[PDB]
Amino acid sequence: IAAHKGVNQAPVPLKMERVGPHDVHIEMTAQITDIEIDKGKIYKAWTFNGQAPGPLVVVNEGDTIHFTLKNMDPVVPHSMDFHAVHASPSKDFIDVMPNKSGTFTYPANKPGVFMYHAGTKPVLQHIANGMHGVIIVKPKNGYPTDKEVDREYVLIQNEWYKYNDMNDFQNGVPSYVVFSSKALKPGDPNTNGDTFTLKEKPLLAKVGEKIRLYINNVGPNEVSSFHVVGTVFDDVYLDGNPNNHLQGMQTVMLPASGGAVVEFTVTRPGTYPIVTHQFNHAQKGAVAMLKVTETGED
Amino acid sequence: IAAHKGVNQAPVPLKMERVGPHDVHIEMTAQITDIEIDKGKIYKAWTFNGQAPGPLVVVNEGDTIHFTLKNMDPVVPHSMDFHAVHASPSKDFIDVMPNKSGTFTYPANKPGVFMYHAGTKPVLQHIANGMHGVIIVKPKNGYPTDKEVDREYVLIQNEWYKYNDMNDFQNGVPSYVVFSSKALKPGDPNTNGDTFTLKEKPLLAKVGEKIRLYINNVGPNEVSSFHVVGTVFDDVYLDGNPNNHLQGMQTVMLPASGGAVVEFTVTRPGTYPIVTHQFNHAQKGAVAMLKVTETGED
Amino acid sequence: IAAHKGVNQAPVPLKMERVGPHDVHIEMTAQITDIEIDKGKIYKAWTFNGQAPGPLVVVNEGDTIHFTLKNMDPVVPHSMDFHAVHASPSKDFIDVMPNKSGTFTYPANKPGVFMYHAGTKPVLQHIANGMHGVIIVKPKNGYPTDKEVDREYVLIQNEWYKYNDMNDFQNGVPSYVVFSSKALKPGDPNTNGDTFTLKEKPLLAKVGEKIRLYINNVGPNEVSSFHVVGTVFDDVYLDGNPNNHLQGMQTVMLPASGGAVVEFTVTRPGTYPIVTHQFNHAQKGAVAMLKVTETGED
Ligand SMILES: [Cu+2]
Ligand SMILES: [Cu+2]
Ligand SMILES: [Cu+2]
Ligand SMILES: [Cu+2]
Ligand SMILES: [Cu+2]
Ligand SMILES: [Cu+2]
Ligand SMILES: [Cu+2]
Ligand SMILES: [Cu+2]
Ligand SMILES: [Cu+2]
Ligand SMILES: [Cu+2]
Ligand SMILES: [Cu+2]
Ligand SMILES: [Cu+2]
């Protein structure tokens, strides 16, 4: 795209504020931002807010979201689809033109770990170029295992293909498959989907802790066989709904866009790989690390 | 196949009749029929009854099926395997020769949404050429959410490959991935697996309705990440068995041959896409549309 | 690998012995062994004990495993990762050098059907070359359907690629996808992952029996759509945990490394194919046979 040559729009912080007991404002951008997806490999990504996957959104079950998208892309329209919400796609997930803004309002009435992404045709093109992310909806009644959890993080899996190549997007194997982590609390890492950051700067935990991960596989195209090496998942909630409760799973199958809340105990000090057990994808980047110490600090 | 050159056997209606409180007769054909799978693209499909996927079969839990296959193919033997039934495959799923008929009897003792397909070696060849379909077995006790459902439809996902190309069937990506709908009640659409019909003539519903879809991914080769845009599944019954109950899923993973009953509410007027969220497959045709109006008519 | 030319190390029996009410010793080898994966096709596999998948391990819930790996490979280090155990991967799943042994101890505190495999970087290379297997952990309280089961077997699905070809391992379709069976009781077959043995020498059962299969899809790369032709699964326990209970499934989705306990009834004499319903993989070898007779013997 000629109008994208040399364009590298600096990341813009997500804006969110509560405006009522059950109403939340969210303002995001669509923007074109260079991301290092593998060492020495820059992808001029189509992004929300200059991150790919986009920034983490967290709301409460029953919140109505008043969402504004500011399209900074000079030529390509973009839109937003939240899997959390009940909305009319042809009225509420519509395109925002370059240099314009649009505001859309819809309720998040289901708890869980939901994908969000651009919904502009061809959707495959917008997702593959980087316009994906996660919104977490916190259950009103929590999860039955809340009291057991010591520490929590968010992980997202995505693929990267040849740059803006629709033939490759449809018909080719992914060039990279990657994990990223998005911050829930101050001090948490906030990273982009790349092959290396969560290996070189592992997530941190303490010996004996029960860890919760909020996870989603945004695709665009692959399913995920999510596994933490050296442990077993004590409890799994499919899509993050507290009713979809499994126990003692070694590996959790996630469809494309599929989410889960998974919980596991780390019993010994060491470094614990986190993989998709589809090992062609792991080899192409989809390995993160969890470093477990006696004190919890690196 | 030389004996298939110029052959286009007109579709023959499914024949079914109840013969006892727990016994049902079903008569189907195997036939060679041209189907437009994408605009301008004719596939000379191997079919049951001139449809691909084949005609919908609905029976009651506990029905014994007395099934007759009339093979109209001039040269290729075909057979029938119903996933619903308990049968001896080497006695009851056997080949029927060209221009012959065979009758086989077996019970459907489990509720759900089951694949059926030809079971003639190489099975991949018969399925990929179009010999797949769905049989629904209605639960004796229903589903716990029956009283909430306002409207229902059947959707089937399948792939199409290069014509009768076993190398492509085994080793290549699908050329098209498609949805079709099969009629449950008079007035429902009844379509074949193509890239366009359910976009141009969407399924219809009314604002506020809870919709049930009986779904199955017949493959032959891909798994499906089934998702309705703009809603969340309130309830999901894996394989259509009422015991396999999930709630609040954004997306339902279906193995090849996997089925489900999914239920969701459409809260606003508009058009709601229905996809496999493996977006390479969606881009290659696997998007249907649900049009929701204030009155339910187009 | 030059040091592997002409190397064909004869299979070595698994060594196991109980050393306390909750402690079990296991001794395995890493060795280089020629396996006929398809008729006329020898793969010089990287193996545990000269089998691929490796020998079956069965322990009780709550057993601590004292595991020794003797590395017979002349040049390549190998390691062991059991999905059953809680361990520090960077301390307990570490490499054993050629011609050395290492001993590692860790508890199996969860019931189920778990993958094991080499954990040496690049893990994809070690798994794809054949270093995978299953460990079964028997639940302390059993399964609720134990009293209904008449006969049981273990089945494992794996893929084979071009020989030691990392490009193919990461980016290519599998050349073969295969089932193998591992013995639980004297007289059970014990086979390697190949395209033919379980077709030519089917598993055996008697008319009317309820069969339990302990299954795992070790990959490395594909998911599995596990289906027994001519029946429906009465009960399914995902990953073999008794709590993850589904009923009446036609087909069970298994992620890469995913396991299950599945149970089904064979009502009539005949031969029942066992497949992954991803039929490209079935065509490339992933069909086993179950022969059901009036007397249960061939
Ligand atoms: Cu507002
Ligand atoms: Cu976009
Ligand atoms: Cu979506
Ligand atoms: Cu704790
Ligand atoms: Cu009859
Ligand atoms: Cu056929
Ligand atoms: Cu089948
Ligand atoms: Cu209603
Ligand atoms: Cu010991
Ligand atoms: Cu190895
Ligand atoms: Cu593993
Ligand atoms: Cu019995």
Side-chain angles (χ1 to χ4, degrees), chain A residues 147-151 207-211 265:
Chain A
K147 300 198 179 0
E148 305 168 14
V149 177
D150 295 298
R151 193 176 305 274
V207 174
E209 285 185 332
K210 169 161 293 193
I211 308 301
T265 304

Side-chain angles (χ1 to χ4, degrees), chain B residues 62-95:
Chain B
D63 277 342
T64 290
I65 295 168
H66 311 201
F67 173 76
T68 298
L69 181 67
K70 198 190 290 197
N71 188 4
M72 302 166 56
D73 189 319
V75 291
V76 188
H78 304 286
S79 63
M80 171 65 81
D81 173 339
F82 290 105
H83 283 195
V85 306
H86 282 83
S88 163
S90 57
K91 292 180 168 199
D92 301 321
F93 297 165
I94 63 172
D95 288 343

Side-chain angles (χ1 to χ4, degrees), chain B residues 81-83 93 115-118 123 127 256-257, chain C residues 227-230 250-251 275 277 279:
Chain B
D81 173 339
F82 290 105
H83 283 195
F93 297 165
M115 177 174 178
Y116 72 72
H117 60 86
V123 172
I127 299 180
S257 75
Chain C
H227 176 75
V228 179
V229 179
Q250 72 193 298
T251 295
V275 308
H277 222 283
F279 254 93

Side-chain angles (χ1 to χ4, degrees), chain A residues 173 225 227 229-232 234 246-251 253 265 268-273 277-280 283-284, chain C residues 81 83 85-90 92 105 110 113-115 117 122 169-171 216 220-221 239 241 244 255-257:
Chain A
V173 297
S225 300
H227 176 75
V229 179
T231 191
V232 181
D234 299 317
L246 301 172
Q247 295 179 243
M249 300 285 296
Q250 72 193 298
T251 295
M253 184 91 263
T265 304
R268 291 173 182 178
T271 299
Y272 291 66
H277 222 283
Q278 292 157 236
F279 254 93
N280 54 354
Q283 178 61 25
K284 292 191 282 190
Chain C
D81 173 339
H83 283 195
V85 306
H86 282 83
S88 163
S90 57
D92 301 321
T105 299
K110 306 282 193 184
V113 184
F114 296 98
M115 177 174 178
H117 60 86
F169 292 174
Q170 294 174 56
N171 297 310
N216 191 286
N221 299 329
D239 273 340
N241 188 286
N244 304 332
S257 75

Side-chain angles (χ1 to χ4, degrees), chain A:
Chain A
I1 297 171
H4 288 180
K5 288 179 182 297
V7 174
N8 182 20
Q9 296 173 317
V12 173
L14 171 68
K15 295 185 199 174
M16 282 184 75
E17 58 185 0
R18 178 162 299 281
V19 298
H22 304 289
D23 287 274
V24 182
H25 275 202
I26 300 176
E27 288 84 29
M28 289 169 63
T29 68
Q31 63 182 83
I32 303 301
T33 299
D34 284 349
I35 297 180
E36 188 172 30
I37 61 173
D38 183 37
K39 294 202 176 296
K41 181 76 180 186
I42 295 290
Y43 199 102
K44 189 181 292 305
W46 300 7
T47 72
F48 296 107
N49 289 74
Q51 291 181 48
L56 184 65
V57 175
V58 182
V59 299
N60 290 335
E61 182 180 352
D63 277 342
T64 290
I65 295 168
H66 311 201
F67 173 76
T68 298
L69 181 67
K70 198 190 290 197
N71 188 4
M72 302 166 56
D73 189 319
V75 291
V76 188
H78 304 286
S79 63
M80 171 65 81
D81 173 339
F82 290 105
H83 283 195
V85 306
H86 282 83
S88 163
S90 57
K91 292 180 168 199
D92 301 321
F93 297 165
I94 63 172
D95 288 343
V96 177
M97 294 302 284
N99 308 126
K100 305 296 179 186
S101 293
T103 298
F104 312 96
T105 299
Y106 23 57
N109 282 319
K110 306 282 193 184
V113 184
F114 296 98
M115 177 174 178
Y116 72 72
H117 60 86
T120 300
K121 183 184 180 189
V123 172
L124 171 62
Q125 187 176 15
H126 293 250
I127 299 180
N129 281 327
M131 302 197 80
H132 40 70
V134 166
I135 175 170
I136 292 171
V137 181
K138 293 163 65 216
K140 168 89 175 285
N141 310 311
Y143 297 90
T145 53
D146 278 349
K147 300 198 179 0
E148 305 168 14
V149 177
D150 295 298
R151 193 176 305 274
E152 59 187 16
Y153 296 111
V154 177
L155 282 177
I156 306 174
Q157 182 179 318
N158 76 266
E159 308 124 38
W160 294 105
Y161 293 82
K162 296 175 186 181
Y163 186 74
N164 195 40
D165 179 347
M166 275 291 279
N167 182 53
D168 197 53
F169 292 174
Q170 294 174 56
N171 297 310
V173 297
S175 293
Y176 311 95
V177 186
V178 297
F179 287 115
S180 60
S181 185
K182 301 297 182 181
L184 283 169
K185 69 183 183 291
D188 283 348
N190 198 78
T191 71
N192 288 313
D194 69 41
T195 62
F196 55 89
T197 293
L198 295 175
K199 295 174 176 64
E200 301 177 345
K201 303 177 179 182
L203 302 177
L204 302 175
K206 192 171 169 261
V207 174
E209 285 185 332
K210 169 161 293 193
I211 308 301
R212 173 180 291 170
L213 300 176
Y214 302 86
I215 67 181
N216 191 286
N217 167 31
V218 302
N221 299 329
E222 306 295 337
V223 301
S224 178
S225 300
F226 186 80
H227 176 75
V228 179
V229 179
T231 191
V232 181
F233 299 118
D234 299 317
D235 298 271
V236 173
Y237 305 96
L238 298 179
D239 273 340
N241 188 286
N243 295 286
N244 304 332
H245 194 166
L246 301 172
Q247 295 179 243
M249 300 285 296
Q250 72 193 298
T251 295
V252 176
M253 184 91 263
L254 299 173
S257 75
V261 169
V262 304
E263 296 166 4
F264 57 91
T265 304
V266 287
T267 64
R268 291 173 182 178
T271 299
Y272 291 66
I274 300 168
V275 308
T276 175
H277 222 283
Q278 292 157 236
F279 254 93
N280 54 354
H281 300 165
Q283 178 61 25
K284 292 191 282 190
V287 178
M289 298 292 175
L290 173 65
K291 184 179 177 73
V292 178
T293 61
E294 297 291 342
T295 60
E297 287 173 15
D298 205 337

